[PDB]
From a paper:
KM also decreased for the AppA-HDE mutant while its turnover number is reduced to ~17% of the wild-type enzyme. Only AppA-HDE showed an increase in stereospecificity, decreasing the production of InsP5 [1/3-OH] to only 6% of total InsP5. In addition, while AppA-HDE increased specificity towards InsP6 relative to the wild-type enzyme, it showed reduced accumulation of 1D-myo-Ins(2,3,4,5)P4, accumulating instead a novel InsP2 intermediate. On the contrary, the variant AppA-HDE becomes more stereospecific than the wild type while reducing the accumulation of the 1D-myo-Ins(2,3,4,5)P4 intermediate. Despite its lower catalytic efficiency, this variant is a good candidate for further investigation into its potential for use in animal feeds. At residue position 305, the T305E substitution found in the AppA-HDE and -HAE variants results in sidechain χ1 angles of 46° and 65°, respectively, for the glutamate residue. Thus, in the AppA-HAE and -HDE variants the E305 sidechain points away from the substrate and towards the active site cavity. AppA-HDE has slightly enlarged pockets A and B due to the loss of the side-chain methyl group of T305, whereas the double mutant AppA-HAE has larger pockets A and B with an overall change in polarity. For both variants, pocket F decreases in size and its polarity increases by virtue of introduction of the larger sidechain of and carboxyl group of glutamate. In particular, active site comparisons suggest that an enlargement of specificity pocket B allows accommodation of multiple InsS6 binding poses (e.g., for AppA-HET), while the decrease in size of pocket F by the substitution T305E (e.g., AppA-HDE) leads to an enhancement of stereospecificity.
AppA, the Escherichia coli periplasmic phytase of clade 2 of the histidine phosphatase (HP2) family, has been well-characterized and successfully engineered for use as an animal feed supplement. The E. Coli periplasmic phytase, AppA, is a 1D-6-phytase (EC 3.1.3.2) and initial hydrolysis preferentially liberates the phosphate at the 1D-6-position on the inositol ring. HP2Ps catalyse the hydrolysis of phytate via an obligatory phosphohistidine intermediate. The catalytic proton donor is found in a second, short, conserved motif with sequence HD positioned such that the aspartic acid residue functions as the consensus proton donor in the catalytic mechanism.
Author numbering: 6 to 410
The structure:
């Protein structure tokens, strides 16, 4: 096999929390550690972890014969697209700095950076709408029939989060006691599914827990001295904590009734980058197809793509299934025996310890990687890849044309 093309859909790197709410204060007697950047911004350490991934990808793509060992990629051989958020733009630059240092590869965004880019979520600008009833029933079914069923099967992990928070000594709990009580997160903050034409979310403990366990993970990856006030001490605890974050993404972002719509512009972009065709300037002034395309997005995007293309995974050593800097990697491979075209999909990521130790990455110290398979592919090769035609058929089935740009 010979590597012809690669599209990397990446989550942004380590960032500060996006919000600092009263409820976050009320559920723990302890003080949340402060962060060195504004809310939701990439930290400098976050960018350094992304550059490690970019350096590794250069070494890997050189070894695969797609990029030259020395010099800068010439004229669009590498292209970078990023969401308008600071954290995604800065992730773009960090990846370029690791992959091709001092080559000044442009980080393209949409023209207006003060407005949402529908590429990373067409619901957000009203390009299309979700089907309310179908989404409600689909999500509730994946939760086990109800959100009460969902949280009941997860009390062990909610109890883990309460211990790390010292929830019993929190303001919320102390009040509950003066008031007949139930000092449990799930019952103090009942969770409801809210489905609108442009969004779905959970209220209450489910969404609070998804956010708090992710913050814990970000503290660890940021190198903070004692994440979770020092109360997270082994990998079992880390996995149990982030299972609440992963479960919320399983419901809200992997569900096909949400994922297929939300992922349609990215699906179109991916297919455009991977399909052989006379090179032509398309979205963002980027010429496609080309050799490497890096797209700096969000964890909803990785989850959306996973849900739409029936790609299932868990990340060994990385409690967050859609971690900072995690990469959904699409590759087009040409089989020399008959010159047929094949698509390979992988999830490339830093383990939590590689982020904790700021481990420089290389061929001899690679990031983790999980081989994926498109569950619906009818034509696979011995190595698990889907034929170009099979992948194209799968994409055309999964995408929602009303959600296209
Ligand atoms: Ni995630």
């Amino acid at each position: 096999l010979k590597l012809e093309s690669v599209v990397i859909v990446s989550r942004h790197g380590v960032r500060a929390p996006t919000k600092a709410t009263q409820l976050m204060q009320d559920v723990t007697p302890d003080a949340w550690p402060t962060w060195p950047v504004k809310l939701g911004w990439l930290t400098p350490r976050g960018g350094e972890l992304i550059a490690y991934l970019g350096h590794y990808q250069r070494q890997r793509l050189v070894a695969d014969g797609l990029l030259a060992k020395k010099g800068c990629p010439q004229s669009g051989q590498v292209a970078i697209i990023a969401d308008v958020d600071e954290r995604t733009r800065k992730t773009g630059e960090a990846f370029a700095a690791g992959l091709a240092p001092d080559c000044a590869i442009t980080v393209h965004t949409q023209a207006d950076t003060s407005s949402p880019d529908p590429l990373f979520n067409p619901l957000k600008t009203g390009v299309c709408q979700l089907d309310n009833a179908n989404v409600t029933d689909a999500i509730l079914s994946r939760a086990g029939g109800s959100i009460a069923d969902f949280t009941g099967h997860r009390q062990t992990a909610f109890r883990e989060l309460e211990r790390v928070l010292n929830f019993p000594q929190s303001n919320l709990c102390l009040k509950r006691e003066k008031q007949d009580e139930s000092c449990s997160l799930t019952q103090a903050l009942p969770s409801e599914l809210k489905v609108s034409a442009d969004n779905v979310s959970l209220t209450g403990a489910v969404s609070l827990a998804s956010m708090l366990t992710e913050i814990f993970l970000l503290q660890q990856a940021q190198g903070m001295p004692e994440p979770g006030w020092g109360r997270i001490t082994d990998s079992h605890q880390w996995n149990t904590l982030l299972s609440l974050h992963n479960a919320q993404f399983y419901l809200l972002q992997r569900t096909p009734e949400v994922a297929r719509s939300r992922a349609t512009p990215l699906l179109d972009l991916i297919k455009t980058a991977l399909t052989p065709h006379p090179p032509q300037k398309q979205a963002y002034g980027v010429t496609l197809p080309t050799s490497v395309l890096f797209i700096a997005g969000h964890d909803e995007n990785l989850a959306n793509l996973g849900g739409a293309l029936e790609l299932n995974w868990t990340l060994p050593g990385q409690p967050d299934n859609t971690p900072p800097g995690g990469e959904l990697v699409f590759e087009r491979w040409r089989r020399l025996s008959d010159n047929s075209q094949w698509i390979q999909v992988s999830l490339v990521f830093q383990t939590l310890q590689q982020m904790r130790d700021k481990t420089p990455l290389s061929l001899n110290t690679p990031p983790g990687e999980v081989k994926l398979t498109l569950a619906g592919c009818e034509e696979r090769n011995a190595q698990g890849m889907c034929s170009l035609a099979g992948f194209t058929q799968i994409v055309n089935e999964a995408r929602i044309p009303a959600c296209s740009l």
